Amino acid sequence: ASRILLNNGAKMPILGLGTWKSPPGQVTEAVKVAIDVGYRHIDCAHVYQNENEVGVAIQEKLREQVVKREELFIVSKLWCTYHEKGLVKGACQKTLSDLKLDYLDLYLIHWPTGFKPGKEFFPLDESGNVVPSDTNILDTWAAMEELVDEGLVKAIGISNFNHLQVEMILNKPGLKYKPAVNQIECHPYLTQEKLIQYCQSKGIVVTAYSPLGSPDRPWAKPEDPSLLEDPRIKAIAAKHNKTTAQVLIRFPMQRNLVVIPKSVTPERIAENFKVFDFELSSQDMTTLLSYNRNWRVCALMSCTSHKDYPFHEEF
């Protein structure tokens, strides 16, 4: 299937286009191209500083009647400096204005860690530690719930929440809407079997980010694993007459995950969508799972002292 059913009753396209690091001067064409070749899910965030340009593309394709708004699934995320109750609606509204939408299909808390509000996305003390917010994530969740009740967003969810933190929301006193999605890093070097099994057992759909291992990540290092260059993965791809990237995208699809590979290259945007016409065997799947080494692209290194840092816990 091309879409998965969420616990809000809506369907989510299992393949979406990522936009983190997509330059503002290229992301408009990238999203136009994506919609032209079949993508119907775009993953956004205010912290990416490119939602206006994403929005130009979405609006042009609606205006051109290439797609209807109901056929699109647009996702964005509440940044850490907006966890205060009183700031959540404005953050959402800024994102909607930038995207030129009147609702989001899904709005996620981007990280469980709240930071001091202000202009800086990572407010620092004079020794370099990130300055936290005293707002807890249960109160931020209630504010996200209000957005559903005001019609600004059709679904709410979370991102980079560990198992105990997911459980904290599920056990929130007076919980009104369960999270629909937990968006987490997931690829053959970070397979996340425990967290995924937990979320799925609870009816929470998992979205896999950095499925290609984010080769364009700013902190990349030479001695770093490279999925795209792993000859074991190239071999599985060759066996199937597909590219390595296509195998890396198909892999989470077959674990009943949603996946959001990023590209600004038209050829690769198209290539990455051509993943509905082949199947990995169970053996292929177990083989890819065996490459796990708990290697993270996105460790939020600067925030390891925050109380709500999600990656001390095993999963």
Ligand SMILES: NC(=O)c1ccc[n+]([C@@H]2O[C@H](COP(=O)([O-])OP(=O)(O)OC[C@H]3O[C@@H](n4cnc5c(N)ncnc54)[C@H](OP(=O)(O)O)[C@@H]3O)[C@@H](O)[C@H]2O)c1
């Ligand atoms: N929730 C969060 O905290 C969080 C964190 C990280 C990421 N995300 C989301 O997940 C998305 C994807 O993750 P990501 O951006 O970290 O990395 P990714 O999708 O794993 O990899 C993107 C990189 O792979 C390249 N690439 C794409 N298709 C390729 C192909 N077919 N062949 C060879 N290279 C290819 C891209 O190049 P070009 O663009 O130059 O083509 C880019 O350098 C993000 O953009 C964002 O939307 C969310």
Ligand SMILES: O=C1NC(=O)[C@@]2(CCOc3ccc(F)cc32)N1
């Ligand atoms: O897609 C992403 N979501 C994120 O939180 C991340 C990873 C780690 O932190 C940052 C910081 C700035 C940013 F634009 C992005 C990011 N990338």
